[PDB]
Design a protein around this ligand. Sequence first.
Ligand SMILES: CN(Cc1cnc2nc(N)nc(N)c2n1)c1ccc(C(=O)N[C@@H](CCC(=O)O)C(=O)O)cc1
Ligand SMILES: CN(Cc1cnc2nc(N)nc(N)c2n1)c1ccc(C(=O)N[C@@H](CCC(=O)O)C(=O)O)cc1
Ligand SMILES: O=c1ccn([C@H]2C[C@H](O)[C@@H](COP(=O)(O)O)O2)c(=O)[nH]1
Ligand SMILES: O=c1ccn([C@H]2C[C@H](O)[C@@H](COP(=O)(O)O)O2)c(=O)[nH]1
Lengths: 288, 288
Amino acid sequence: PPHGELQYLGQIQHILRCGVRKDDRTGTGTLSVFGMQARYSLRDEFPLLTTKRVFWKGVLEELLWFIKGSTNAKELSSKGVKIWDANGSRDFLDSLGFSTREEGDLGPVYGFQWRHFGAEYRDMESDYSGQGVDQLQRVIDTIKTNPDDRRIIMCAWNPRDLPLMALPPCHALCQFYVVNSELSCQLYQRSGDMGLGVPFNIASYALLTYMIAHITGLKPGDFIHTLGDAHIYLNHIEPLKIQLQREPRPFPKLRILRKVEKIDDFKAEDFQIEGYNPHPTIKMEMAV
Amino acid sequence: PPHGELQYLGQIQHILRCGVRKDDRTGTGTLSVFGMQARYSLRDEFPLLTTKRVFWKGVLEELLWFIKGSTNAKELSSKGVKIWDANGSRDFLDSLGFSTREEGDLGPVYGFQWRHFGAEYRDMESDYSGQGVDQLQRVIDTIKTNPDDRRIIMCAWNPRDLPLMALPPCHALCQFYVVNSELSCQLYQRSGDMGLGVPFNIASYALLTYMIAHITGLKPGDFIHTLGDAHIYLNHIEPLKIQLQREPRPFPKLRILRKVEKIDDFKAEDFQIEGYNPHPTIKMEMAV
Ligand SMILES: CN(Cc1cnc2nc(N)nc(N)c2n1)c1ccc(C(=O)N[C@@H](CCC(=O)O)C(=O)O)cc1
Ligand SMILES: CN(Cc1cnc2nc(N)nc(N)c2n1)c1ccc(C(=O)N[C@@H](CCC(=O)O)C(=O)O)cc1
Ligand SMILES: O=c1ccn([C@H]2C[C@H](O)[C@@H](COP(=O)(O)O)O2)c(=O)[nH]1
Ligand SMILES: O=c1ccn([C@H]2C[C@H](O)[C@@H](COP(=O)(O)O)O2)c(=O)[nH]1
């Protein structure tokens, strides 16, 4: 049965063969399937794709930025990771009616929701200590005290806060699961740019699972990737067909370099990707 | 093309063969798999399971109760549907520390979240008109004005309100999708009692999709059922093996008997299940 990267490549094939033409906001157009699911083992391997190089630096710095609760694009940008900068620009903020908002202030996105769900958002520089639900720490506490729990959820989709966000979250929610000393994670991704977003998104949530497993004394299990609108932008078709011709190399491994006690204490240098031997980057133009 | 019900029966088989032993609060125990997905066509058929009779009256009355925004178990009970009554009882409310709460008051569950997400909950008798986000109406409006939208979400998972609820929602969220004049729906169900809950849950969201398609002038497409902890209670194993001997009968059809303009105007007598030929109920004791 296909395993690891062949799940992702199988999804690409399925959308090319069975996807339906579907317009989008950008006017680019897509081939689209609604509802997919892939399973990536995390057991002695880390699912960083090898058929094209994934932006691992971006994955790791973005995740650390989420964990600290930041909603400031400038703070991620300062680390050489520019993926949120367009959505924090003066022009983009004004386009949403946020003329009074400071440049970089993404509103109550991921970081805020994860650490302060339900608090009143003010700006990206405010102190939210003790405010709202700390979903991330509550996930960790539940795994430690009640691993059988079937409500181990972290949700970024906050209908009250959506109008203030720079972008509605794509990763609406995730759920953790423990059995036989293994930690698994399922992501509900409402919308997946299969060429540009999804490889990165797989790595983010696999990383998060490695982090939480390390904190809780468990072994990584599976990452289950569930998609809503799974789509290939029309201008990614030829690049993806090039990618599909490449034979995958074995996944790398991820090493955590020291014992870390609290999720907030992880730093970028604590992580080491080993044996990563990807084929070259394939240029895929982003839609918006 | 295979009967859609064989997806469900395939899931039962997979859990019996590959599910792992996993304890629960009741001490019943389960066999459990994390992460499953099935697709049920809604095109000229309604996926009301035939290998054991589904409580259709319960499906329909519960859904109408959700749509009106109710959080009062007594109001559902009055229609002959007792499925929430134990969770609203004096005893159960007291067991959660809700000694001051009136009997029947489930707290900010589905109905409240769907129609008033983010409003302040008081009690089951309060007027919430105009308060919070009406997710249900916003879903319907978006389908009508911008069908390509990839953010058509209704979320019941509200971390701020969880501690007031009689039970945390199993149906954490759902997402709608439109292509070629067909409306599809995906449910993220965090926890699935495969014997007792899941058949009912499939029917609820298929129904909701039929309702919203009727309101918006679209044809029903697919229902995609995604599970988190998909589990068989140990005392359902033998009953389910009896069920697995049965060949499915062709699915019924669902007829909507008049033109209805607003989701709030649907009544129970507007719906007719046609050609439903289930095998008999098999007794499966619920875990408490
Ligand atoms: C998670 N994320 C957001 C993302 C992904 N796909 C999208 N696709 C579309 N159509 N629209 C989006 N806003 C979008 N956003 C990402 C992730 C990576 C990069 C990125 O493409 N490239 C690095 C790579 C640099 C390197 O490896 O040397 C960069 O140049 O910013 C962009 C956005
Ligand atoms: C969806 N749902 C809630 C549900 C399902 N499985 C669960 N399973 C567990 N372990 N715990 C729960 N709280 C639970 N809740 C249901 C659905 C049907 C019935 C049920 O008992 N139906 C009828 C059948 C009667 C008829 O056909 O007219 C009844 O006798 O009440 C109960 C709960
Ligand atoms: O982490 C992310 C962020 C965005 N996207 C995608 C999906 C869509 O192509 C686009 C978002 O647009 P909307 O779904 O909100 O229309 O970027 C991803 O795949 N991953
Ligand atoms: O609509 C519903 C409501 C509940 N359950 C199940 C799943 C679990 O077996 C139990 C709820 O318990 P927790 O997952 O919250 O532990 O009832 C369903 O399958 N469907």
